[PDB]
Amino acid sequence: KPGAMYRNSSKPAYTRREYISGIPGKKIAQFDMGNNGAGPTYPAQVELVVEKPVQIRHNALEAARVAANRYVQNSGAAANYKFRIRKFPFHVIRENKDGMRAPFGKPVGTAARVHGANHIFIAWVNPDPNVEEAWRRAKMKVTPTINIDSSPAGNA
Amino acid sequence: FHEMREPRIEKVVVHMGIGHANAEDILGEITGQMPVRTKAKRTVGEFDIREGDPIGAKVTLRDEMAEEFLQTALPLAELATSQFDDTGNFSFGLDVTVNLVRPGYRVAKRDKASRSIPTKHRLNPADAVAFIESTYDVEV
Amino acid sequence: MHALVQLRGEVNMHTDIQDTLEMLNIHHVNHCTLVPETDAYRGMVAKVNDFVAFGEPSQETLETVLATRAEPLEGDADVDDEWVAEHTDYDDISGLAFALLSEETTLREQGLSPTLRLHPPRGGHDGVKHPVKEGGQLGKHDTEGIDDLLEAMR
Amino acid sequence: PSSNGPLEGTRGKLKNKPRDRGTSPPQRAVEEFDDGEKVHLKIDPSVPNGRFHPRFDGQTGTVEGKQGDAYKVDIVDGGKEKTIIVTAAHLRRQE
Amino acid sequence: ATGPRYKVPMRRRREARTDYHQRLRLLKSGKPRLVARKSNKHVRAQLVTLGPNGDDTLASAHSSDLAEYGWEAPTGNMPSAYLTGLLAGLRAQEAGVEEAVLDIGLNSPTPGSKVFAIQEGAIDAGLDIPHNDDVLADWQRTRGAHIAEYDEQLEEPLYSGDFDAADLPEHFDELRETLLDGDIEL
RNA sequence: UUAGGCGGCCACAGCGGUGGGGUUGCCUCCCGUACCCAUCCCGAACACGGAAGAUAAGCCCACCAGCGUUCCGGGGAGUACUGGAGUGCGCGAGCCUCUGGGAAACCCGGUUCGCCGCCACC
RNA sequence: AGUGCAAGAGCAAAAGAUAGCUUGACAGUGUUCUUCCCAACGAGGAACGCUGACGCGAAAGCGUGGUCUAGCGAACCAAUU
RNA sequence: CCUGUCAAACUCCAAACUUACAGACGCCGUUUGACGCGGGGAUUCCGGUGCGCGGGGUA
Ligand SMILES: [Cl-]
Ligand SMILES: [Cl-]
Ligand SMILES: [Mg+2]
Ligand SMILES: [Mg+2]
Ligand SMILES: [Mg+2]
Ligand SMILES: [Mg+2]
Ligand SMILES: [Mg+2]
Ligand SMILES: [Mg+2]
Ligand SMILES: [Mg+2]
Ligand SMILES: [Mg+2]
Ligand code: NA
Ligand code: NA
Ligand code: NA
Ligand code: NA
Ligand code: NA
Ligand code: NA
């Protein structure tokens, strides 16, 4: 199913698991990537900034993350960098799969609500921005247009 | 300062935690005054499901009745240290507990304007060992 | 004291906004009233802010308008100096105007209609879809700003 | 509403902020009002008795006689006149 | 204490001085309260009314200012209590007070207790108070007979120096007698 | 208020901690069970009777801000949100301007270790 | 925590627990709110009185069933006081 | 200790705003009698749209 069905934040927040059952597990494998043993003790810090509030299905998060980290293997399986996806798919989504009678759908997935300007991804690297590239591929698999922003890094 | 800071025995509770009694009799003679029933709470597998139910007795002794008892109880006990309260108490043994404290305790036991005893005015394990050990026996 | 001029009609405007205009004695487009600057009056003009034009007019302007569009509580009679002197506490229009501006009296108190029914603005006004700060004609105006509108509607 | 009992939708108005929790001071439960006085109606979550229908919480009526220790306040619901039987515990002097 | 949500009891509850549930039932009568209070050495009796910023004491009596009338005996006993009640009851009358209800605070409703002696005193002073006669002591005990008899089992004076050796419930009568006519502050 | 009783507001008063105070007078702890009364067992408590001793508790007095709380300055912030208006922008989601209101978190610095009423009293 | 049972709310010298005692889960008749916001409409419900008789308590007082909001039924006919 | 996120059926907080009563101005009423009271006669109980706020629904 298309992102068109769930990319807008027009519905009420629906996240109370105490009143919702049968919610599908998330496809997001990890949130901390790279040298998670080390702390953000890096010279450079780039972030992927979403430019519009939207809803991002755990589907897109996993594909976006994989495509970025899977690529960050331009530095090696145990390379020197740490990657972080700060958002979690809290918002439960339904689908009305009778016609419009008794239409409250059934849980079919989850999605994370990101507001325009938040960073969904943050990487930490030494002057070796291959990460900038890992993100051109990341925002490629998420609905919104995105801004690739660098913070600690006046080494231009 | 002292005199009103020096420990003293306030009640010695002798109780026999049985599991369902005929035992009161011996408590009455060992102490010198009537025992009190020991009801239990909660329903449990040791065929002890009855809420209100005699399951042992106790006896709270005060003043001479407490000394005249310890003047034989203590001798039948050896232990000391670690086996002492953080408030200067200790139980040994059929159980025999000795509650110790200093002169102004009624402040915490009375009805009107009651209050809790300040930590400083409390009795420490150490200050307790001294008092008792200094009364016919030895510590550890 | 501010000069109030309704520049937008009644159709589709909130009722509670319309009643306000009515409480301020304005019942038609281009109708103008003079309102003291008080807490109570201030709240009212603010509520009516999007369908009117208001501001403090200059002595002169007020005089021009008074002379040109003032009316007795009843009748055609022209409100000229003579009228003013033979009917009011003051001796001439200028005297009246000053009093109004300094908020010492009111058009009723002097047996005059609370409303100065103005003429459409000669040359057209700046638009009723945008405020002054945006090139429009709605909202608070400059004393020079209000004067132009009032004068154009003399 | 899914139901129509008196306490429907009263979760808020009949609950105390954690700190105002517990038995309330007796001073205001004994307060005496005179006929004609204006009194604000507000239920004390902590005080069970002497209550009035939650829908009137917020009203400001006029004391006009009492019934037992309870007072009879006149209020106007929308455009209807009504009399409310309420104890001091739930009233406050206006001004 | 612990957090923003924590609930701190009322000051007079923390101090374990006022029983607010009883207080409210007391304030129900709409009558003044006859506050009966004790101390190891003394006994106090007040007639309190309700006020805007707190209670108003319109009349009081303390077992200490009892000597001010000829008391030469201890002041933490039964005869003491009654008299202190009668004294406060009288000053009460002077103040224009006609009735009241007995507030014994945190004390126990034990029959023949000093608070009830306080209540009997105030009543005889002329104050109208809701009571129950057979919860009161039997007059003799009020007189202080129980103490005289106790000194009979002498061998050593019950009173260290004080007054008398065999004590005097008669001293009691002389005083009640005194309080029942004229004299200052009454 | 050189120590008390009854309260109002019910943490500005809570939690924790330091120092000081009783020679006759007050509160206590304290001493003690013939009585009224009392412990499903204990004068522990409750109740009654009393001063040999003490200021160590409590309590009263002076003070500390580490925690909790109340209010204030500056910053966050005229941000977030919002009542009224718009032939302003945007494929749209949505945004912007004018007008009237206006926050929360958090940081830094102050404040707060109760206030007040009635009665009694070297 | 507990308070019979949904959910939300109330409650700590208690509305909870224990003990003891008691039958107010009483008869009569109302006021008011609710049912039905506003705004007419029955049964039902609740709050708050009074009259009478009682329970407990030293007493103020508390008890018009269970802390509060669910647990309810017209006319005709029968049986019953 | 540090570090990453949330709530229609969460709340240590908390608007704009809505709302009871009162006073003030305004407007209105006392020959156009308002507010209110009593009675006669209805029609009406398929609605729709814009904007704001919504809930459902891919729409
Ligand atoms: Cl009501
Ligand atoms: Cl007392
Ligand atoms: Mg005319
Ligand atoms: Mg032209
Ligand atoms: Mg134009
Ligand atoms: Mg000291
Ligand atoms: Mg009830
Ligand atoms: Mg039939
Ligand atoms: Mg039958
Ligand atoms: Mg609303
Ligand atoms: Na079907
Ligand atoms: Na994209
Ligand atoms: Na309360
Ligand atoms: Na038993
Ligand atoms: Na001391
Ligand atoms: Na009915």
From Swiss-Prot, chain B:
In terms of PROSITE patterns, this protein maps to: RIBOSOMAL_L5 (PS00358)
InterPro entries named among the record's database cross-references: Ribosomal_uL5 (IPR002132), Ribosomal_uL5_arc (IPR022804), Ribosomal_uL5_C (IPR031309), Ribosomal_uL5_CS (IPR020929), Ribosomal_uL5_dom_sf (IPR022803), Ribosomal_uL5_N (IPR031310)
A single Pfam family, by name? Ribosomal_L5
Q: Which GO terms describe its cellular component?
A: ribonucleoprotein complex; ribosome
The Gene Ontology biological process terms listed for this entry are: translation
Protein family:
Belongs to the universal ribosomal protein uL5 family.
Q: What's the subunit arrangement here?
A: Part of the 50S ribosomal subunit. Interacts with protein L18 and the 5S rRNA, and probably with tRNAs. Forms a bridge to the 30S subunit in the 70S ribosome.
What are the GO MF terms of this UniProt record? rRNA binding; structural constituent of ribosome; tRNA binding
| Record protein name field | Large ribosomal subunit protein uL5
Q: What does this protein do?
A: This is 1 of 5 proteins that mediates the attachment of the 5S rRNA onto the large ribosomal subunit, stabilizing the orientation of adjacent RNA domains. Forms part of the central protuberance. Modeling places the A and P site tRNAs in close proximity to this protein; the 5S rRNA and some of its associated proteins might help stabilize positioning of ribosome-bound tRNAs. In the 70S ribosome it is thought to contact protein S13 of the 30S subunit (bridge B1b), connecting the 2 subunits; this bridge is implicated in subunit movement.
From Swiss-Prot, chain C:
> What are the GO cellular component annotations?
cytosolic large ribosomal subunit
An example of a Pfam family matching this protein is: Ribosomal_L30
Query: Biased composition, Basic and acidic residues: where in the chain?
Result: 123-144
Q: What does this protein do?
A: This is one of 5 proteins that mediate the attachment of the 5S rRNA onto the large ribosomal subunit, stabilizing the orientation of adjacent RNA domains.
Assembly behavior:
Part of the 50S ribosomal subunit. Binds 5S rRNA.
Protein's name in the database: Large ribosomal subunit protein uL30
Q: Which UniProt keywords apply?
A: Ribonucleoprotein, Ribosomal protein, RNA-binding, rRNA-binding
Q: Which InterPro entries match?
A: Ribo_uL30_ferredoxin-like_sf, Ribosomal_uL30, Ribosomal_uL30_arc, Ribosomal_uL30_CS, Ribosomal_uL30_euk_arc, Ribosomal_uL30_ferredoxin-like
**Gene Ontology biological process terms, A to Z:** maturation of LSU-rRNA from tricistronic rRNA transcript (SSU-rRNA, 5.8S rRNA, LSU-rRNA); translation
**Family the entry assigns:** Belongs to the universal ribosomal protein uL30 family.
Disordered: annotated span: 114-146
From Swiss-Prot, chain D:
Keywords for the protein's UniProt record, in alphabetical order: Ribonucleoprotein, Ribosomal protein, RNA-binding, rRNA-binding
Write down the InterPro entries for this protein, in alphabetical order.
Ribosomal_eL21, Ribosomal_eL21_arc, Ribosomal_eL21_CS, Ribosomal_eL21_sf, Translation_prot_SH3-like_sf
What SUPFAM superfamilies does this protein's entry cite? Translation proteins SH3-like domain
Pfam families xrefs: Ribosomal_L21e
For this record, the Gene Ontology CC terms, alphabetical, are: ribonucleoprotein complex; ribosome
Q: A biological process (GO) annotation for this entry? A: translation
Q: Where is this region: Disordered?
A: 1-65
Classification via PROSITE patterns: RIBOSOMAL_L21E
For the keyword Ribosomal protein, the answer is yes
Q: Name one GO molecular function term.
A: structural constituent of ribosome
| HAMAP family documented for this protein | Ribosomal_eL21 (MF_00369)
Assembly and binders? Part of the 50S ribosomal subunit. Interacts with protein L18 and binds the 5S rRNA. Has been cross-linked to L18.
Q: Which NCBIfam families match?
A: PRK04306.1 (NF003303)
Which family does the record assign? Belongs to the eukaryotic ribosomal protein eL21 family.
Q: Tell me the function of this protein.
A: This is one of 5 proteins that mediate the attachment of the 5S rRNA onto the large ribosomal subunit, stabilizing the orientation of adjacent RNA domains.
Q: What is this protein called?
A: Large ribosomal subunit protein eL21
Top-level taxonomy = Archaea, Methanobacteriati, Methanobacteriota, Stenosarchaea group, Halobacteria
Swiss-Prot record, chain E:
- Which organism was this protein described from? Haloarcula marismortui (strain ATCC 43049 / DSM 3752 / JCM 8966 / VKM B-1809) (Halobacterium marismortui)
Q: What is this protein called?
A: Large ribosomal subunit protein uL18
For this UniProt entry, which segments traverse the membrane? none
The UniProt entry, under InterPro entries, shows: Rbsml_uL18_euk
GO CC terms of this entry? cytosolic large ribosomal subunit
UniProt cross-references to CDD domains, sorted A to Z = Ribosomal_L18_L5e (cd00432)
GO molecular function terms noted in the UniProt entry: 5S rRNA binding; structural constituent of ribosome
Per its UniProt entry, which superkingdom is the organism in? Archaea
Subunit annotation: Part of the 50S ribosomal subunit. Interacts with proteins L5 and L21e, and attaches the 5S rRNA to the 23S rRNA. Has been cross-linked to L21e.
Enumerate the Gene Ontology biological process terms: ribosomal large subunit assembly; translation
